[PDB]
Amino acid sequence: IAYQDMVKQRGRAEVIFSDEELSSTIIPWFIEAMSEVSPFKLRPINETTSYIGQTSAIDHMGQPSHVVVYEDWQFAKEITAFTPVKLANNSNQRFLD
Amino acid sequence: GFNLKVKDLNGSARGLTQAFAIGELKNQLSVGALQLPLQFTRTFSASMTSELLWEVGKGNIDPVMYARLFFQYAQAGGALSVDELVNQFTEYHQSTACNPEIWRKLTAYITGSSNRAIKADAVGKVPPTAILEQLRTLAPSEHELFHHITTDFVCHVLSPLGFILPDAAYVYRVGRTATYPNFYALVDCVRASDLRRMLTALSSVDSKMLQATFKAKGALAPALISQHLANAATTAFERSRGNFDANAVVSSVLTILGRLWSPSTPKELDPSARLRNTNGIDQLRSNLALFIAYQDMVKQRGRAEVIFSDEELSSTIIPWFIEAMSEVSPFKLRPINETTSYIGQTSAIDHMGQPSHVVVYEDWQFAKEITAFTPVKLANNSNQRFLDVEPGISDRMSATLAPIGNTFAVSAFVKNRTAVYEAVSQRGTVNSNGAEMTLGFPSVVERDYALDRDPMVAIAALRTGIVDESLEARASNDLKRSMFNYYAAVMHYAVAHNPEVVVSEHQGVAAEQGSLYLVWNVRTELRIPVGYNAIEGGSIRTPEPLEAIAYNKPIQPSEVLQAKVLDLANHTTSIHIWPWHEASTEFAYEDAYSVTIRNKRYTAEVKEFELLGLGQRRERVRILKPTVAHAIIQMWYSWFVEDDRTLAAARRTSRDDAEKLAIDGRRMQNAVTLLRKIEMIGTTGIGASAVHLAQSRIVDQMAGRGLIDDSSDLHVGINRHRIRIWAGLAVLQMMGLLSRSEAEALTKVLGDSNALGMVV
Numbered sequence: 001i002a003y004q005d006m007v008k009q010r011g012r013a014e015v016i017f018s019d020e021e022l023s024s025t026i027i028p029w030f031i032e033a034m035s036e037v038s039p040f041k042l043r044p045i046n047e048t049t050s051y052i053g054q055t056s057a058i059d060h061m062g063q064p065s066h067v068v069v070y071e072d073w074q075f076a077k078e079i080t081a082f083t084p085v086k087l088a089n090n091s092n093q094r095f096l097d
Numbered sequence: 098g099f100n101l102k103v104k105d106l107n108g109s110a111r112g113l114t115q116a117f118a119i120g121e122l123k124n125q126l127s128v129g130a131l132q133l134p135l136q137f138t139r140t141f142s143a144s145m146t147s148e149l150l151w152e153v154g155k156g157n158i159d160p161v162m163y164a165r166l167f168f169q170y171a172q173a174g175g176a177l178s179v180d181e182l183v184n185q186f187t188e189y190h191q192s193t194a195c196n197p198e199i200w201r202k203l204t205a206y207i208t209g210s211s212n213r214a215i216k217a218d219a220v221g222k223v224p225p226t227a228i229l230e231q232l233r234t235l236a237p238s239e240h241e242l243f244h245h246i247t248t249d250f251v252c253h254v255l256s257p258l259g260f261i262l263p264d265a266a267y268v269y270r271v272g273r274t275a276t277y278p279n280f281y282a283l284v285d286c287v288r289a290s291d292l293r294r295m296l297t298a299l300s301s302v303d304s305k306m307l308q309a310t311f312k313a314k315g316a317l318a319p320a321l322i323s324q325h326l327a328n329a330a331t332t333a334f335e336r337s338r339g340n341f342d343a344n345a346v347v348s349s350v351l352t353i354l355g356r357l358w359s360p361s362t363p364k365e366l367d368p369s370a371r372l373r374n375t376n377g378i379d380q381l382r383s384n385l386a387l388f389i390a391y392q393d394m395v396k397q398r399g400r401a402e403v404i405f406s407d408e409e410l411s412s413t414i415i416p417w418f419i420e421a422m423s424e425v426s427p428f429k430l431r432p433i434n435e436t437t438s439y440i441g442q443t444s445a446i447d448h449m450g451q452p453s454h455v456v457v458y459e460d461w462q463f464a465k466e467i468t469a470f471t472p473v474k475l476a477n478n479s480n481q482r483f484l485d486v487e488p489g490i491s492d493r494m495s496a497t498l499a500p501i502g503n504t505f506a507v508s509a510f511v512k513n514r515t516a517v518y519e520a521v522s523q524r525g526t527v528n529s530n531g532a533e534m535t536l537g538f539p540s541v542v543e544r545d546y547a548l549d550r551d552p553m554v555a556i557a558a559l560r561t562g563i564v565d566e567s568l569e570a571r572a573s574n575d576l577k578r579s580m581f582n583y584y585a586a587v588m589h590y591a592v593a594h595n596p597e598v599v600v601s602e603h604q605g606v607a608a609e610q611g612s613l614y615l616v617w618n619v620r621t622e623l624r625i626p627v628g629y630n631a632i633e634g635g636s637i638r639t640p641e642p643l644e645a646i647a648y649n650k651p652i653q654p655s656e657v658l659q660a661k662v663l664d665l666a667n668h669t670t671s672i673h674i675w676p677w678h679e680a681s682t683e684f685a686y687e688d689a690y691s692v693t694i695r696n697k698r699y700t701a702e703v704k705e706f707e708l709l710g711l712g713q714r715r716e717r718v719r720i721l722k723p724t725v726a727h728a729i730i731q732m733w734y735s736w737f738v739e740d741d742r743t744l745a746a747a748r749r750t751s752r753d754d755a756e757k758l759a760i761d762g763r764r765m766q767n768a769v770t771l772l773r774k775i776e777m778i779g780t781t782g783i784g785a786s787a788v789h790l791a792q793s794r795i796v797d798q799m800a801g802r803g804l805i806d807d808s809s810d811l812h813v814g815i816n817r818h819r820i821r822i823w824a825g826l827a828v829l830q831m832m833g834l835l836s837r838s839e840a841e842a843l844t845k846v847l848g849d850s851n852a853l854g855m856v857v
Contacts (some may be wrong), residue, residue: 010710011789014782 098735099538099556099583100743103455103647104531104628111562112580113587115641118389119603119612120396122562127614127640129630131601132360137592140385141278141428142436145540146725148663149271152672153245155263156253160296163246164289164425166269170242171285172427173272174679175548175571179285180343182240183292189243190295193236194330200323206231207260214320222262225252233479241480250299254307254326259316268668269675273725274427275544277585278386279578280347280393286428287343290421298333341415345404350411350418351391352401354382358391359613361602372412377419385433385592388615389585395612437593441654442646445515447525451626454518455647456511457536457590461729462659463502466495467832469684470665471718475673482674486665487718490684493709494832497782498726501834504777505730510537514736517767520759527626528756530747534647535736541582542728546833548575549679552731553839555579556739588615591642594649595619617645660725681719686831690791690823692816694799695807701794705831708783708790723833730834734843737771741846761850768852771843775825776818783831787824814855822847 007013016022023030035042051073057066082096101109107126111117116127151162171179193199205211207228208220225248232244245267255261278286307329311317357368372378381387395401404410423430439461445454470486514535545552558564558580564573592598595617603611620636628644630637639645686705691698706714741764748760778784796808810816826844829835835843 010786011793012785 098535098732098739099559100533100535100736100739101560101643102530102532103534103643104527104626106628106641106643110559110643112559113584113641113643114562115392115588115614117562118392118396118584119614121603121606127603127616128601129616129638129640131616132599133358133601134597134599135358136383136596136598137385137388137433138383139380139430140387140433140436140589141422141426142386142431142589143274143276143427143429145273145276145439146658146660147271147273148661150664150668151269151271153267153269154249155265156249156256156300158246158249158253158296158300160293160300161424163242163296164292165271165427166242167289167292168285168425168427169269169271169274170240170676172274173270173547174676175575176240178281180281180288183288185240186243186246186292187295189236189238190247190330190334193247194334195327197324197327199235200327202235203228203231204319204323208319214318216316216318218316220260223260224262225249225265230476246296250304250330251326253300254304254329256308257312257316266672268672270663270677270680272663272680273543273547275578275582276540277582277589278390278426278428279581279585280351280390280397282428283347283351283390283422284343286426287346287418287421289425290417291337291339291343293421293425295334295337298337299330301333303332304329341404346415346418348394348398348401349403349407350415351387351394352403353407353411354387355391355395355401355613357382358388358600359602360600361611369408369412372408375412375416377416380430381419385589386428389588392612392614393581395610400610433589433593433596437590438655439658440590440593440652441511442649442652443511443515444651445518448523451525451622451624452532452647453525454515454532455534456514457534457646458507458511459538459540460654460656460658461507461539461725462657463506463726463729464495464498464660466662467491467498467723467726468662468665468721469494469718470669470681470721471715472674472677480674480676480678482677483672484665484669484674484677486669488666490709490718493782494720497784497828498832500781501726501778501829504774505733507537507729507732510733513767513770517763520762525626529759531626532647534643536587537732537735538583538586539725539728539732541579541586542731543725544582545579546724546727546731547680547722548579550575550579551836551838552728553735555583556735559583587642587646591617591645594652595645614640615642616640617642619645619648621648663721665721681721682833683716684718684720685714685716688823688827688830690795690820692795692811692819694810694816697802699795699798701791701798703787703790703827708786708828708831710786720833727833730829733774734835734839737767738839738842738846740767741849745849765850765852768847768850769854771847772822772852775829776821777825778828779821779823779825781828783828784821784824787827788820791820791824815853818853 027033034040051071053070053072055068055070056064059065085095085097087093087095099110101113103109106114111122114126116122119127121127151166153159153162167179167182170176171182176182177185201211207223208217209215228248228251229244232248233241236244238244252261252263256263275282307325311322353368353372356362356366357373406414422428439459440457441460442455442457444452444456447453468486469488469490470484472482472484475481475483518533520529542552545555555576558576564576592615597618599616599618600613601616602613605611617639618636619639621632623635625632625637627647628641630639630644637648684705686708687702689700689702691700693699704714706712744760744764748757751757751760779788792811795811796805799805799808811820826835826840830837830840
């Protein structure tokens, strides 16, 4: 999907052409870059959609009249209410009681 | 790209006439027949194509380096003249170095107290950067140079090595310089060697015994050395005396060189054979730069006077004029054969044939890279910065730079220039107003783009030979300085190919004295369309260097004269910096493509960061002005516009029905070459990025307002060619290559003639 996005905005893709050699040896580190640092960490595609449900309405035969896709979410538990306290002026440093 | 009709110079280019230079603008022109000869072996020329980073040392107070930098500061951007730059330093140096209050203040600032004085074997080293931090508050000078030059004086006298930690890295940019020594530039050279002796006085055999006096027997009480250094720097100052007035030096040394060049050496005084024998005066009377400088001086001054310390003095004092010129100056002495090495010449022809079109050019190589940097301040109120060069912008533009170099190379320029001028059924002629001559000199134009001037205003002044008296001092002075660099460059090439020449006096207007001028001789073919001269015998005598150049034969240039990139990457990443700001530019660009589709107009806006395909935008980064590359393209531009201008008024003044069908020929013809060139650039890393952005935003605009189906028309022939030209003009603008003002006058040209072949 990232590819689709890029080519939509860029309209071309150009290469450093240091390959066939370079980026096969340097870099895989693109892999390392994506694996460790990022919030996006790699998952099996079966388990990425686990929270998604689907349900159909129906007619007599029948074809669906109404189909609803959802994410099962649980509400609550608490709503925290805090009062900020400044230790030193000019800074965002705070205790939150 | 300065184009001229060789026949009438007074009409075509007044600025390039020698008669102009010696100050006769009257209908009378210099008389081809007069007296005494001469041969030029050498001249003074500066360096082309050099971008260098110069570290300023631990110590050591390099007395030449500083005096050189002074020139580079006064040159690469205007600050007065290097003369005024010097007596500003002397005033500074007096206000600082002779003042004991100030010496007390900084000796106290290092350690330990303003009052109490302690030998203090405990006290450790101190950073030079910290001494400069103080100096910015103590002696608030505009030119931060001054703070270093005094600084590493103290680090020179402060090095038992205890108190000074010799750790800092500081660098300066030595860039392109105007090539040839204007009269007042000479005065500036003498004035810089005044600085050479000034500094070599500071670092001394007696500043070094300061190490050896207090080396015994060890560390001593500080309160002393404040009064000692103050007298130490004064002795260095009081010893270097103004002595000889630098103007009076140059005035009188050139004046006598004027006396032994001239065929009129009057009754009263002609040079002594003793001073005639003085070493180097042989290469002095044979120096070309010194001659055009004479012309310069006597044009402005109108007389030449002597210090009259001669006959003796200037045989003994000075040769030192030589010393000033030898070492300090960027103008270092060269053989006149090797000075014109980058200049070629090529002629078009008719059947027989005489040259129809003659092009003089400088071989220049483009590219390689274009650097983009973001300045980072270490300390406020100072121009001290690290410059982090951030690539991927530099690489991206440099990628688009390679194809511009191919399509705009000077080689392609001279190729496409010769083949245009031909007319139906040959034969010539003196008709069309004769044999045109065009000469590009990016070396000269680069100066104007470097000094943030319109090259076209200097160019205009050449043709007319008159300047607007209203505009401010620095403005005209930058113009005239540039206007000289043209004439200077001309007579260097002109003489380099015909060294045997004759000097002759002028009648005079008063007549008082007179100006010495130059005449050439050259042998050639029978019939001359070219500007009036005999030619009488297959050889011809001429005063004007253009006529002289027109008669030479095609030339192969010896050297490539490749312009080089400055290296920010390796150095500046770890180091502090020079006067960078006026030499760079804020990096931001906006442009917009508009078009009409089915009686409705859509417009897309585009920004610089979108063009390099990134987000969002970084405003802090800047681009180093690629002044040289711009000057090369100018040569192209200056042709297109200026030819179209004269060709338009040519068609109006042409009554003949047969002549006009020829004029409109050259017009549409080279106009499409301008089209094909730009259209090519419209396809590039940027060019394609631009067209893509523009087209996409229009369709996004077309989905909303109605139906999309009209977008099929964007892919039709004319619109496709339209959008491409725009991208091409936009990319050139978004690099240092096209002023919005000049590209506008280009668009007008492409539209003045319809200049669109549909071509199926």
